[PDB]
Amino acid sequence: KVFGRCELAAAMKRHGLDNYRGYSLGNWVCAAKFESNFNTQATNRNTDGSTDYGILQINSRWWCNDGRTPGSRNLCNIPCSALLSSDITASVNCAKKIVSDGNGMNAWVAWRNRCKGTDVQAWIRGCRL
Numbered sequence: 001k002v003f004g005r006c007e008l009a010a011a012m013k014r015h016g017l018d019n020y021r022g023y024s025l026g027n028w029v030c031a032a033k034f035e036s037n038f039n040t041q042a043t044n045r046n047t048d049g050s051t052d053y054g055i056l057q058i059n060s061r062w063w064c065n066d067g068r069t070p071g072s073r074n075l076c077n078i079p080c081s082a083l084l085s086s087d088i089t090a091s092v093n094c095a096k097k098i099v100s101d102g103n104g105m106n107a108w109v110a111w112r113n114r115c116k117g118t119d120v121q122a123w124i125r126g127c128r129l
């Protein structure tokens with residue numbers, strides 16, 4: 001499913017991401033835009049053999065099992081295909097564990113390079129929240 005900007009913002013708020021670990025809703029919307037273009041079916045292979053999955057591009061090196069990343073971890077205890085659902089519950093719950101892991105949102109390269117230090121509030125502008 002390809003989410004609209006305000007539709008995603010509302011689902012993320014519903015799921016409790018707004019100000020989670022001090023990151024405002026705009027940060028998560030900005031990250032999702034640049035990681036997956038709001039597409040739940042997004043997948044990208046990494047140079048090391050692992051793969052990023054879903055709207056928040058969660059990677060199989062640590063977080064999920066995709067049956068093809070030998071010697072990796074499954075810290076969110078899920079198949080990576082669960083991250084590709086039209087329902088973002090599994091992605092949001094895994095994102096909460098990632099952001100709590102010590103490095104905050106710097107875990108997302110696209111956030112660090114494209115969202116961090118910018119006016120992220122612009123991403124929830126005009127939305128009925």
Ligand SMILES: O=N[O-]
Binds near residue numbers: 061068070072
């Ligand atoms: O993602 N472990 O194959």
